[PDB]
């Protein structure tokens, strides 16, 4: 059901030409680390803006689980990302790549317009804990891919005025701009 995305995106994600969409794009990666801070596991959120006008939303949260969920016969976290939230987001990205820290693994999958490359896969170690989603927005979705600070500022204000106990670092690597937002 990317497919209906992919054809109909501006039923999902808003307008794809005026910037609307481009932004609620960050908007609901956001929302999903905004749930796990109120569900009690996330005290610290990353938003990044790249020099090339991609986003990472990171997060240290419990972050995703990897355990293969037996209907589909994947990783949990691969679920998530494809079945119709924020598959909506991977389904207009031409590329978003997922890093998952969980039991002391770092666990990485890569979509290209929602579609997994490989099956989520063991990268590395850590003693850390949370959820990283790079993506960069299809150009066959999305004229003029350009992110405002100004937007995002805005949003994490919001977010951050509406949950006092979260910190949220806003960094802009065009302009070297960073912020943390916490009431
Ligand atoms: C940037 C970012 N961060 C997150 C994020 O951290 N979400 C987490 N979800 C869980 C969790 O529910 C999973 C099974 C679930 C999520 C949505 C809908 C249905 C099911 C279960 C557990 C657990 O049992 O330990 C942990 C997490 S962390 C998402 Cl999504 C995004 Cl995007």
Redesign the pocket.
Known sequence: GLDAVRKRPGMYIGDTDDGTGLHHMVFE?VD??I??ALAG??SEISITIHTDESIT?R?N?????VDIHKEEGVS?AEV?MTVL??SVVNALSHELRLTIRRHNKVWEQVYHHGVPQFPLREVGETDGSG???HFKPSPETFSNIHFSWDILAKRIRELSFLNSGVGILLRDERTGKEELFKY
């Open positions: 990666v999903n680390s749930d796990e596991y996330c939303v997060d949260g419990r972050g995703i689980p949990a998530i939230g924020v959820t990283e989603v």
